[PDB]
Design a protein around this nucleic acid. Sequence first.
DNA 1: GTGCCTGGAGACTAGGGAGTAATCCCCTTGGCGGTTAAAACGCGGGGGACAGCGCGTACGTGCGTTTAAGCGGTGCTAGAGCTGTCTACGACCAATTGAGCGGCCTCGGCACCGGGATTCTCGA
DNA 2: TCGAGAATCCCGGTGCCGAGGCCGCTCAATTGGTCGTAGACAGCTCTAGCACCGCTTAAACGCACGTACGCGCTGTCCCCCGCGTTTTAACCGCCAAGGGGATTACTCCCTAGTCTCCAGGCAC
Lengths: 79, 79, 102, 106, 93
Amino acid sequence: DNIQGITKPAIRRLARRGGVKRISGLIYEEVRAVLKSFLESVIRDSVTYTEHAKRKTVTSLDVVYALKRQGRTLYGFGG
Amino acid sequence: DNIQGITKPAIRRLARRGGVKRISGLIYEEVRAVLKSFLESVIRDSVTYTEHAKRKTVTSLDVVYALKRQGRTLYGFGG
Amino acid sequence: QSRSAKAGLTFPVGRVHRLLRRGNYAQRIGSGAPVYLTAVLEYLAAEILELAGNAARDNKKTRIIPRHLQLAIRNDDELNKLLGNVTIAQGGVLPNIHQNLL
Amino acid sequence: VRQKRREKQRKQSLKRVEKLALYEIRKYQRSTDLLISKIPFARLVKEVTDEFTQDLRWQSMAIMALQEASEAYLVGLLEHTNLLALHAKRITIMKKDMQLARRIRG
Amino acid sequence: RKETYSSYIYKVLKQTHPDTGISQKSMSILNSFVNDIFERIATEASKLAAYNKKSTISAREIQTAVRLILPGELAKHAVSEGTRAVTKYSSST
DNA sequence: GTGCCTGGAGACTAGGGAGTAATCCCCTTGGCGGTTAAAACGCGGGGGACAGCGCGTACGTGCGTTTAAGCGGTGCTAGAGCTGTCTACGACCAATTGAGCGGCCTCGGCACCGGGATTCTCGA
DNA sequence: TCGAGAATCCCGGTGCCGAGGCCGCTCAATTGGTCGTAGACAGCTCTAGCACCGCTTAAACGCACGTACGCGCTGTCCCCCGCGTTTTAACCGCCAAGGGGATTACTCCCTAGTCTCCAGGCAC
């Protein structure tokens, strides 16, 4: 069981980091749901990248190119 | 003035296209301002395209290329 | 004997291979590549023309208008994933009054 | 002047034959054509191009594509602000409703 | 005189649904759409070719690009159509 | 600081783009009339925006407890390069053909226009 | 009451401009012998993730005060809105000048290829 890898005070401290003070109880489960729907496309795109690389280990440059294709470019892990 | 050429019933019919029941009297000036801002943001690129090309006609190809550069691409006028 | 008549293709596979060659994209293009490009463009064209034919069928007009193509591209979640950002000229918008105003 | 006679005949035909706000929403949602008056919009985009110009010409189809793209962007922003307006328990929209969608899009 | 898909669009329209007519602006919209998705798959195939040391664009590069861009049902039907046409091409020269 | 391997720097010879003559030439920019559907001024209003109250509950906050879980080690395990070695492998210029554009001519449902049958008024 | 004649409902004829088809054609699509060059496999190592747990260890689970405020009701208050009325410039047609877009191409000039010599650049 790894669907509860994140915990409720972690989302609470992330809300204090952003500026959300008062949090509802459904917000943590909706955050887990939007994390589920958010990571899936980029990770399956990295699986397509690794299939293009015809190997087993997912390399970091494939992750950077997948996040560049999705529109979520990250700086510091390639180039 | 040409910024007030899009009058009040024009924005009223636009809102009725967009499904509004009742509208306020503070909408129209901000609609005209954001329309002027969007027109400036697309026209600057659309005229740098025609200024590079040794031309003075702002061609439909230039405006569809400037629209494709800024995300919102149109279909039917090239490309 | 063209490369299109070697597989029953209709989209111009030799012209598409020419635009891939002299088109500032890459260096080499394999022989199995532009037939597959012709295949996927033919599948997309067949999908959008079948959707336009259905849109012309249920709207009692025997021709294809951009409103039919707009209702084709906007009433499908796979087409909203593919081309949910571009627009169609004189296509109009989606008629959908929200439930709170109703 | 046979074109003028045909135009007068068509104008006479339109003058004789062709000639609770809930109806206009469902009416203007099935319309396909443009909705902004043409030559004042052309004068406006001529004034906008005067800021970043030189006698720069203008094709008519380019101004048509500009009018279509601007109408599409405006109805997109308006359809997105209607949801935030009704979310704040406002059937009547306000300028504060077209501030968050102008803010969180960028 | 520009290389337009218009006759090919009318040809592939006449095979499955010949009863529907086609206008000019809608046909130009179709041509611009197929050119847009063509250049998108072209730059994605060139990008994936320049990624991992394969300058030759084979069927592998463009099938990875089709699996990359399209959704799951669309990529499944597209890879089915592509495998069908590449068998029909490599069989009949 | 010290350093050797290698992309960087660069002139000479084929060989393909640049902008200046040249001329159509089509699209446009500018203005005159009309007429008309749309823009604007105003006026009563009523329905929707807005302030305030009732409340209760559920999260702000704190406390006992478990509960993985983090930091550090290290073998187990199995996935990522690199130099040889050989095979495919996609392009180059040229004769022949081709198939979609330039401009032309033919249908066909939609809107306008006239008769056959029916109904209304008067006359015979 | 008969009958002839005028009005109208419904059926049949005809412009008409956009969809469909077509002859002429002319710079690209096909195939080809060749040819420098990508590239796919393999020994071989080396190196990064995984499991167990040695040893600690803050942190979440969950229950209990308590009060801030989300939702709903009640009253307020006024601002766009339907509507009428007056104005006004948009659209259309048309007259007119002309100005950059498009097409042709040549010396020249800047680049692909070529070999030759040297100063950058992360590793020790």
